[PDB]
Design a protein around this ligand. Sequence first.
Ligand SMILES: [Zn+2]
Lengths: 73, 73, 60
Amino acid sequence: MQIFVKTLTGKTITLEVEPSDTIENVKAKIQDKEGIPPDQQRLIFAGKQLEDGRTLSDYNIQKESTLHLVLRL
Amino acid sequence: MQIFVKTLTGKTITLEVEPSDTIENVKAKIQDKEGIPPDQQRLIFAGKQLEDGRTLSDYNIQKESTLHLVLRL
Amino acid sequence: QSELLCKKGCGYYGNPAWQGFCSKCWREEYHKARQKQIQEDWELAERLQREEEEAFASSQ
Ligand SMILES: [Zn+2]
């Protein structure tokens, strides 16, 4: 499936994922494209910050779903 | 991957295997460690005795899976 | 808030692939079912052991 990660600075990363993929692995995928390290990444979906050891399916992230990315400092 | 073979006498052999490995080859691996010949080995998984010409994948033996070993007489 | 909520009711969402459970709850269930196969397999092993010993002594 495919989901989207919108930055606050006018970038929409398009990821190739599976419902079984861990949040941690999704943040690795973002690294593959954007070069941002996983520990410098906050992911948001439906008002929650996404927890590393949980999966997309745990949050009901389906086809087309859109998350947000905030950088840690 | 890694699977475990528990004896009835307080030994747990830890094997290094692939899903493609044949039961026969797994019994060769046990020989490498324990010196027990393949034809003196009964392997058990999920209530079945494991057939020599079949593979780990045929029985759905995955990561961490635990079989048992009975000696033939 | 829908029908997709995890069957253990721990608040997270379940997965069709994991029969209704979430990732963490599915792990516990998987470990639980694995514990049972080891136990049953040990019991099988015992039977096969007793049988090999009986079949042996049924020689000399
Ligand atoms: Zn759950």
